[PDB]
Amino acid sequence: ATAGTVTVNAITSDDTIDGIELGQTISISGKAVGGDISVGDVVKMTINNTEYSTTVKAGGIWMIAGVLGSDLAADSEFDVVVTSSDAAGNKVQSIGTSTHSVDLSAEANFSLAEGQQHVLTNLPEGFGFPDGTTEVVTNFGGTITLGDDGEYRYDAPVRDHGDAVSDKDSVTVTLEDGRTFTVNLDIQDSAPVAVDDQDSIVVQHEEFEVSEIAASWVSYTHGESVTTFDGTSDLGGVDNDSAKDQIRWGNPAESKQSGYGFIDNDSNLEGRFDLNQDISVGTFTHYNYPVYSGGAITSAEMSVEFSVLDHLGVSTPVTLTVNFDHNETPNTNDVNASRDIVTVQNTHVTFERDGDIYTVQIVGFREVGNPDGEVVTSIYTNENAATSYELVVRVVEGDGYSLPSTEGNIFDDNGLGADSLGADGSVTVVGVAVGAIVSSNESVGHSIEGQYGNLVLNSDGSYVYDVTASVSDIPAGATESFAYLIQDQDGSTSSANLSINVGTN
Numbered sequence: 001a002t003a004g005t006v007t008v009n010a011i012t013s014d015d016t017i018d019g020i021e022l023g024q025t026i027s028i029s030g031k032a033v034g035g036d037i038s039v040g041d042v043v044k045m046t047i048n049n050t051e052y053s054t055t056v057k058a059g060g061i062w063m064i065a066g067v068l069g070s071d072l073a074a075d076s077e078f079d080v081v082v083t084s085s086d087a088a089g090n091k092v093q094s095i096g097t098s099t100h101s102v103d104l105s106a107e108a109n110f111s112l113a114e115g116q117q118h119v120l121t122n123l124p125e126g127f128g129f130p131d132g133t134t135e136v137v138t139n140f141g142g143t144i145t146l147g148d149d150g151e152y153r154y155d156a157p158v159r160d161h162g163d164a165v166s167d168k169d170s171v172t173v174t175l176e177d178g179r180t181f182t183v184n185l186d187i188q189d190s191a192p193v194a195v196d197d198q199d200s201i202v203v204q205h206e207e208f209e210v211s212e213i214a215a216s217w218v219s220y221t222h223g224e225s226v227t228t229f230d231g232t233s234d235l236g237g238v239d240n241d242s243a244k245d246q247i248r249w250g251n252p253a254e255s256k257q258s259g260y261g262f263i264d265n266d267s268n269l270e271g272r273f274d275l276n277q278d279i280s281v282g283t284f285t286h287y288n289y290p291v292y293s294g295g296a297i298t299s300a301e302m303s304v305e306f307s308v309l310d311h312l313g314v315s316t317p318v319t320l321t322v323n324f325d326h327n328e329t330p331n332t333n334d335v336n337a338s339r340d341i342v343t344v345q346n347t348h349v350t351f352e353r354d355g356d357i358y359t360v361q362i363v364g365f366r367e368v369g370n371p372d373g374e375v376v377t378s379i380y381t382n383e384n385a386a387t388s389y390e391l392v393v394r395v396v397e398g399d400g401y402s403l404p405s406t407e408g409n410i411f412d413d414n415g416l417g418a419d420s421l422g423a424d425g426s427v428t429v430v431g432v433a434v435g436a437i438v439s440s441n442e443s444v445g446h447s448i449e450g451q452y453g454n455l456v457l458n459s460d461g462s463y464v465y466d467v468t469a470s471v472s473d474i475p476a477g478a479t480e481s482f483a484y485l486i487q488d489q490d491g492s493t494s495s496a497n498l499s500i501n502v503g504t505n
């Protein structure tokens with residue numbers, strides 16, 4: 001008896017029993033050909049301790065109609081034996097061997113937002129918990145719960161998506177029949193949602209009726225040959241009063257004396273001041289000549305006197321004292337170093353009118369004819385030259401301790417709802433900027449300059465905005481817009497705009 005070749009085809013198409021085939025009946029097949037193998041010969045095989053048999057068909061084909069999937073899952077290797085004979089009664093056995101893989105697992109993949117409950121849909125066919133189990137705890141301590149309604153719900157924990165620890169949760173369910181189901185839960189990050197904010201602030205307009213101004217140099221410290229006088233054509237130019245608007249000093253080292261002159265702004269003011277408005281009370285001229293060392297003042301005081309009229313015709317006199325520190329510097333071959341320096345002090349005076357109080361405050365020096373120019377408190381003048389600047393004051397209601405302001409918190413509901421913080425929390429303001437664009441920057445908790453005023457917005461969302469612009473520079477419908485950026489625990493960010501209506505009345 002000559003043995004043949006016994007072959008076993010793949011056990012299912014992929015040669016592996018999976019979790020669905022586990023519960024099904026599976027046809028096995030193969031061939032038995034060659035040698036003394038003849039049609040009708042017996043084919044036998046033991047699978048998981050059960051014997052299955054059939055016969056060899058024409059062409060050497062053999063098949064087993066139905067083997068239990070559970071048997072093939074329990075026994076991954078088996079022999080097939082074909083019993084044959086030669087013509088002369090002699091027996092022989094042809095043997096083939098089959099191996100297959102067993103993988104009863106199945107995975108379900110989800111990508112779900114943190115801090116929310118989610119119904120798990122499209123689970124793999126046959127998914128379920130072991131009898132009695134209604135909850136499985138995930139690797140992260142979350143849960144998949146089977147509810148009354150037969151739905152499976154996953155409670156996605158909040159995660160720090162910025163750290164070095166993966167945020168892909170997972171759990172494996174094991175059933176008694178050997179199946180496993182691995183649920184992979186990619187936890188997605190949440191973010192805050194900043195919401196635009198609205199605030200408003202009104203600046204008070206009011207016009208005062210004022211007398212002519214009389215400016216007098218009333219005192220000085222140090223200096224030689226110091227004199228004070230009403231201005232003349234040759235020395236300072238003329239004004240409409242007899243107050244002493246010119247001061248001169250020094251022993252001239254080349255030609256004339258150094259000093260100051262102040263020509264009031266009576267004609268331009270036309271007897272009116274406005275409130276909350278940069279106003280020029282006059283033109284200050286610094287005449288810098290070379291004088292011998294030790295002959296110059298170090299400070300001088302000028303009284304700016306004027307009366308304010310109320311609606312009943314009562315005049316209130318007002319004296320703004322203006323202190324100037326003077327530095328007549330040693331002269332070298334360096335022109336810039338040789339410049340003489342005048343510094344005006346930020347003084348003020350408060351007067352009463354019709355039961356309200358108002359404060360006149362020195363703002364400082366402004367280049368002549370440049371009423372939108374930068375205001376400075378120190379001016380520099382070359383030797384052998386004179387510089388001229390408007391002396392700018394502002395009048396405000398009250399004691400002048402603070403400018404018109406409005407405050408708030410961008411986390412509050414300021415007209416369109418409160419910022420949403422997201423599941424991560426730990427939200428703070430990390431950036432603020434004037435305009436429409438902002439990123440995490442170094443302006444939070446700082447004073448930043450807007451179009452009409454300054455903003456201090458802090459990390460906790462609180463802000464103070466104060467108007468610095470003159471009334472005359474605040475157009476109808478004026479508006480500030482500050483973009484701010486908030487950030488949660490693991491870096492998610494959201495921007496919104498704080499819009500401030502800046503009005504006049």
Ligand SMILES: [Ca+2]
Pocket residue numbers: 011012013014015016017018021
């Ligand atoms: Ca298969």
Ligand SMILES: [Ca+2]
Pocket residue numbers: 019020023126
């Ligand atoms: Ca099944």
Ligand SMILES: [Ca+2]
Pocket residue numbers: 036037038084085086087
């Ligand atoms: Ca035979």
Ligand SMILES: [Ca+2]
Pocket residue numbers: 046047048075076077078079
């Ligand atoms: Ca076996």
Ligand SMILES: [Ca+2]
Pocket residue numbers: 009010011015098099100
């Ligand atoms: Ca195989």
Ligand SMILES: [Ca+2]
Pocket residue numbers: 015099100101
């Ligand atoms: Ca294989």
Ligand SMILES: [Ca+2]
Pocket residue numbers: 159160161162163164165166167
């Ligand atoms: Ca993480």
Ligand SMILES: [Ca+2]
Pocket residue numbers: 114158159160161188189190424490
């Ligand atoms: Ca997160």
Ligand SMILES: [Ca+2]
Pocket residue numbers: 212213214215239240241264266
């Ligand atoms: Ca005058």
Ligand SMILES: [Ca+2]
Pocket residue numbers: 230231238239240241242243
């Ligand atoms: Ca005069």
Ligand SMILES: [Ca+2]
Pocket residue numbers: 215230231239240241242243244245
């Ligand atoms: Ca005068």
Ligand SMILES: [Ca+2]
Pocket residue numbers: 258288289290291328329340383
């Ligand atoms: Ca000088």
Ligand SMILES: [Ca+2]
Pocket residue numbers: 328329330331337338339340383
């Ligand atoms: Ca000098």
Ligand SMILES: [Ca+2]
Pocket residue numbers: 199200201406407
């Ligand atoms: Ca307000």
Ligand SMILES: [Ca+2]
Pocket residue numbers: 194195196197410411412414417418419496
């Ligand atoms: Ca907001």
Ligand SMILES: [Ca+2]
Pocket residue numbers: 161189190191192422424488489490491492
């Ligand atoms: Ca986040």
